[PDB]
Scaffold this active site. Structure first.
Site, PDB file in Angstrom:
ATOM      1  N   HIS A  74      41.929  53.048  80.200  1.00 18.79           N
ATOM      2  CA  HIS A  74      41.050  52.400  81.285  1.00 18.79           C
ATOM      3  C   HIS A  74      41.060  50.861  80.919  1.00 18.79           C
ATOM      4  O   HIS A  74      40.113  50.370  81.179  1.00 18.79           O
ATOM      5  CB  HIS A  74      39.703  53.119  81.094  1.00 18.79           C
ATOM      6  CG  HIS A  74      39.884  54.639  81.101  1.00 18.79           C
ATOM      7  ND1 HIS A  74      39.969  55.196  82.139  1.00 18.79           N
ATOM      8  CD2 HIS A  74      39.201  55.386  80.017  1.00 18.79           C
ATOM      9  CE1 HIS A  74      39.913  56.708  81.804  1.00 18.79           C
ATOM     10  NE2 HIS A  74      39.591  56.664  80.614  1.00 18.79           N
ATOM     11  N   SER A 126      45.346  64.224  77.741  1.00 14.47           N
ATOM     12  CA  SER A 126      44.329  64.446  77.186  1.00 14.47           C
ATOM     13  C   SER A 126      44.429  66.020  76.976  1.00 14.47           C
ATOM     14  O   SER A 126      45.510  66.580  76.151  1.00 14.47           O
ATOM     15  CB  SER A 126      42.949  64.284  77.733  1.00 14.47           C
ATOM     16  OG  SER A 126      42.846  62.879  77.697  1.00 14.47           O
TER      17      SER A 126
END
Lengths: 601, 593, 590
Positions: A575, A460
């Protein structure tokens, strides 16, 4: 112990949602176990936890909630044909009973303190009400936009809920608090003009006041989240003299499931909460008239979730060298670290200098004395901390012969508000300095680190920073950029947070000409012509937070310059392990990481 | 009541006009009836064409190919895609191939001994007399154009050396005999292989290395690795590059030798497409060129010619040796109207455009439509969308600004490296001349709209003037930098069109100054955004950036995200995308005028 | 007025299993076109609470207590053997593609025996499974020896003996079977004596056919002695009633070394009795106006299900009701009145259930099947619903019924349609005399199985009835003998006739109601399942075709679902449609 590979993950079982019983003498929690992970309920009365449910199909059981009388557990069940159904399990004997029959299922059940009702949401998701004595269900409230946090008043007269008015306010992260009484058919009346971020509602035992986690409307979202006592539309900060945010914001890759952090009143004067401090997360108490005191704070550990009442406390605890374990009143009730299949090693601290004071990081070395490659890892956020969370990825990297270097540059969240604000509007300046200065101090302090075999990697914001660094220095022999950002302009239009993120973090609006040019000067893609480092790119195709167009631009640019590049496009979103229990994405990602490191280092 | 988008369903779409070897018959494809279009083969020997196959499931039948003896028709059937053989004198079609993923591009050998085709893509070979199938060639990169030598000794194939050269659109020509040697060092764009009857030379369509792909495609004769241009004295490109929305299926344009000295080809000239002949000793002569019509596809031999013809007022029809054999214009469900020409002046000479008005005498809103490309032409193609706009009370204004392709190479080169300058000038200058020349156009109820480059230009114009009352941007481009990294042509498109490389710092800044998103803060015009979610040519991130920017500025905006990719009607026969698109267009125009 | 939908308000109990310590009872309850599903319930003395919850399939059945009282084995639905800890926790799946049936713990708790037909054995401590015995023909009754050394099993030698209801008893020790009794006859309900050597069984010795009362026999070294002496009544529940869904255990249980507890049918009632090794039968729990349909027992406690003509079945534990199922009955129940008739064998009895009010009501003569069963003091929702809709229900126990002595059964042997038809019409005539509210001009006759045979027989011998409803009927005794899955044995036992013998077949034809079908004038509703193996549908097809040829008003309901579908799959559609057709036909003709 066998040779460690990415497969070592499959030996682990993941705990979550430590729910203390009302009388404080028991804890029920969720454990995800093995190939697909499924979750079941576990129970401990002080000793070794024992399984309470066992799922063979679907995702399993989650969200255990004690009935106030302590005789039943409500929970959510995901089976082969059921998405998520509310169950009631008598603890003294018998099988769980299904209570709801919805095609799309339910989420977030909460008993009323008197045990007469269970509130939950189902499909925006509407709020429903289960009458326990009457065994009847009824839609309570159907919001136009959606409901955030929810908590019952202590007298069970209704609930407080957080919601926005429109999509625009929600996009700007502006919310209010409403009072919603039980229906006598009835609409919610506004209780607090907050117009800002709010969650973690903690109604005071007096039935009138309540606390919340968040920030007032004046400050931007880089401001530390704090504790505020609400009384008749006024707010008073409770965690005064405590320059640290509420909640766990420390890295770690062994969190699967729900991790409750709602503040809880231990008495009429004491509010228990968690807070991130210099790579650690501890429990603290705020006093109704101000002042913070430590409750359970290990500077080398992370408390990732907790529940509490006037009679007991249950939590999950971890460190850089200890896998997450469940505790009940200070007694460990799980043996989950014993399942970790290879020896863990101790990190060594390495510091660096900044104009705001000393920064810190860590080096995790492998066994032996020979020279080893040095991997600079950069955490995302950017307002999070590295430190004392358990990171299976870092231990595995060291177990495979790599020195792992990870630090908390300016912009990290556990070193005061000023440390966060240091990077405002100028990503790629002092944060990049801190990361490269920290890495230089690692090479100096640890001669085992091989300065000729170095790599840089992060996710990120860490992917943004990996792209930025490789575009400003050729020093690294390999690079791995994960969920990256490469073009700040297009991010603003494509990201589901693009409209507010750059405004909060940089004070820049991509839809404004002058601001857009500044965003382009902050975009790593402007400097891509300087990249010579072989780069592995990892990204999800369906990513809504960091759209894959960010990674496609970096790949196409490196490919045009004939820079060695590899682009792993996952069909699974991030995730995925928590979403469906499938560990394939994590295993393949680790495989690609080490294959790339093996070729270039 | 006024006709709506449903008028599309009344039409049947012709394609692939294949003349028989003896020149006396034509076989073609017709797609006819949300209701779904399916394709079948049709046949005419001079009179009204009759159906030859009838498909009720799948996409239907396509790619009719005559056997050299004239007694059989090969074609591809989807009921995935099977090679069929149908005897024309009587009987049923026989399935010949058994592949899971199907076939494409069948071509008989001139001696009738073989049929070549591709499958996954590998080139396969069917032995006609032996009824056997066999893999011919499995390329690493892929095969482009394909043609048999006249003596059926083998095939010529176009392919690149690597993926990078393919990404850069650079190809060579190879010789592949029956069961490959490089035959021409071209290193550039090439297609339409037309082997000379002598068995040694051959012609191709394309451009030599040197200048980018904005150079007009021309005809080149290849002899012993050397090349010389054949369509000399003709400052116009080969092939149909004129707009029109009634082309569904394959439209062959391969050049054909009428004799040893004459090569027949099509060419785009000032909004029209005509047939021309290039002579091995000499320049270009007109063969069948109506400056007010478009020949969209043709096949030919020494005995006959078949083609599809259309105009701005005439629906596409199939012809055989100059005689119309279809009745497809009769199916158009409302009267078509005729456009009037409006000119504008530039430093390179006179530019032209057209206005299509509705019936009556009252004032009507004025819709400036901008064609994509940008190196294509508006003009004399049949556009159902434009006729429907006029039938619903709108004045349609469409022109060929500098950058269009039918007015000489200099007209193309005027916009090189500077999109948004003289092309935008020409469009607004033309529109101003429309309001002056056509008093029925309502200057207070105007809209601007276009697709692809026309969407780029719609975004550019509304960011530089508030004069328009409505805007519709389709498959748009808003950020030239991100386009370079996300588009399947991004690595080469800006290099050819602008001389700019998005991966180089200095060029990227210039690309940002050419990006309509830099000037989005000036947009006040209510905008409808139309885009496919799965678009690989113009990725949807281009439209997402425009939507988010207008929405943040509180500009009235609507974003239609299609799950179906563009050209879905040709892809699966489903007209839903086109019908929904037109509905969104008119709903937005009715709301804002 | 209540309709057939009233059935859906009811929940049906079954399999009352007393705990080893006698202080708890676990049982099955099936409750809610809407489908019935079954789950386990538990009571320790008070109101029973649900213990399992099934949402798909047929549900849970066959609860079996662990000897230590801490676990329950049961069957979950194809069919998996489950183990549920009673003090807390979740059930565990233990076993097969085709499922399981009939689990039985070993007395020492070391094993669980079951069938899946092969006999399997689950090692509880070792958590292992193993095939115990795969018979060629099949296993009947099964019981563990008290020392858990093995099981006793009932089997035939070949398919021919099985069709003829001839069985023997075998000894099967635990693996690492020898014949125990030359019985050559019908046997079930093995009750091993606590001494580990002797055992009792329910059945009849060879010699007389199966019309002989089933009795209790004590076995010792291949010898047998009747145990329920001085008791001219059969063992087990043979009383009518339509609120029995699931398994109803009736296995005899030794209360001590000298006392064997058993159930027996006596004049329309079923009571519990004890047989003593040293003497006759004594009453244990016998209400002459009630029915005990199932029971389990040990030396410490007894659990049972009890019902009457006016009380829905309830579960009891040591004389204390633990269910509230009669409260669910959605309309008031009415009380029947007794009406008697005279025969050469003594007084016969029947009952009349009237509607509310005092006005004239139609009279419905209902005939029970068997024929060796009893009407009487079972709970019959169908009869109560008929009375609630304005019909007088007349039902009796003619000669041939089973609860009035062996001679009462034997009166019809070889001559169906003589004294049994006489008793039914004699009883009905006495109903019209004794109950003036019954309308003699609006009468109907109806019955199932043997009652359908008799409905066909009566309407072929008198036109007195205004309507007829024949259910699962028999019309042609010859074809029945060749098509029925009991055709090879039924007429031999009941009539002494063999359809494959010329002289017997003619006699069977003279007993066939179809010979006399030309006399039928009564509008008849015919109800039959297409897949019936016991009474093949050809029996009903012949009656329909014959009545239709004679232009008698007739309606033929052909069910795709077999009989007892509610117990089979939980779907009540067949029962609801059947009642709808019954009342529609009665409404049309009165």
């Amino acid at each position: 112990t066998p040779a460690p590979g990415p497969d070592s993950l499959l030996a682990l079982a993941f705990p979550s949602d430590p729910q203390v019983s009302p009388d404080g003498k028991q804890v029920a929690f969720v454990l995800a176990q093995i190939p697909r992970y499924r979750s079941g309920l576990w129970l401990s009365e002080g000793g070794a936890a024992r399984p309470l449910t066992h799922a063979e199909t679907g995702r399993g059981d989650s969200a255990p909630r004690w009935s106030p009388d302590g005789q039943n557990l409500a929970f959510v069940r995901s089976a082969g044909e059921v998405k998520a159904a509310l169950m009631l399990l008598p603890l003294k004997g018998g099988e769980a009973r299904r209570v709801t029959h919805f095609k799309n299922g339910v989420s977030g059940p909460q008993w009323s303190p008197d045990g007469r009702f269970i509130a939950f949401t189902t499909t925006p998701a509407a709020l429903w009400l289960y009458d326990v004595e009457a065994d009847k269900l009824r839609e309570w409230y159907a919001p136009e936009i959606g409901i955030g946090a929810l908590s019952w008043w202590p007298d069970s007269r209704g609930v407080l809920i957080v919601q926005s008015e429109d999509e625009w306010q929600a996009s700007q992260w502006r919310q209010d608090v409403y009072d919603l009484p039980l229906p006598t058919a009835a609409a919610p009346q506004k209780l607090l003009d907050w117009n800002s971020a709010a969650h973690g509602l903690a109604p005071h035992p007096d039935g009138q006041r309540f606390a919340l986690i968040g920030r007032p409307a004046g400050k931007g979202n880089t401001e530390h989240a704090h504790l505020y006592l609400i009384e008749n539309g006024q707010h008073r900060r409770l965690d005064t003299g405590h320059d640290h945010p509420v909640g766990d914001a420390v890295g770690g890759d062994c969190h699967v499931g729900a991790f409750p952090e709602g503040p809880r009143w231990l008495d009429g004067d004491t509010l228990l909460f968690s807070s991130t401090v210099r790579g650690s997360v501890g429990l603290f108490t705020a006093h109704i008239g101000g002042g913070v005191k430590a409750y359970d704070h290990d500077p080398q550990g992370v408390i990732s979730a907790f529940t509490a009442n006037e009679h007991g406390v249950a939590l999950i605890r971890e460190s850089a060298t200890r896998f997450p374990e469940v505790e009940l009143n200070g007694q460990r009730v799980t043996d989950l670290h014993a399942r970790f299949p290879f020896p863990v090693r101790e990190p060594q601290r390495v510091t660096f200098e900044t104009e705001l004071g000393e920064g810190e990081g860590w080096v995790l070395l492998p066994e032996g004395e020979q020279k080893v490659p040095a991997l600079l890892n950069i955490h995302g956020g950017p307002h999070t901390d590295y430190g004392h969370g358990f990171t299976h990825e870092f231990q595995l990297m060291a177990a495979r012969g790599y020195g792992v270097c990870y630090s908390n540059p300016r912009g990290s969240v556990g070193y005061g508000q000023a440390w966060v604000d240091a990077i405002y509007g100028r990503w790629g300046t002092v944060d990049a300095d801190d990361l490269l200065n920290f890495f230089d101090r690692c090479l100096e302090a640890v001669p085992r680190l091989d300065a000729a075999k170095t790599a840089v990697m992060g996710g990120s914001y860490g992917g943004f920073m990996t792209n930025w660094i490789t575009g400003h220095t050729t020093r690294f022999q390999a690079a791995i950029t994960d969920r990256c950002i490469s073009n700040l302009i297009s991010f603003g239009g494509t990201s589901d947070i693009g409209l507010r993120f750059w405004d909060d973090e940089l004070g820049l609006d991509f839809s404004r000409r002058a601001d857009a040019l500044k965003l382009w000067d902050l975009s790593p893609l402007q400097y891509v012509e300087n990249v010579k480092t072989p780069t592995l790119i990892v990204h999800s195709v369906l990513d809504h937070r960091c759209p894959v167009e960010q990674a496609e631009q970096w790949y196409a640019a490196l490919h045009k310059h004939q820079v060695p590049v590899r682009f792993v496009r996952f069909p699974e979103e991030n995730h995925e392990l928590s979403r469906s229990g499938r560990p394939d994405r994590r295993l393949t990602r680790l495989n690609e990481y080490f294959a790339w490191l093996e070729r270039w280092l």
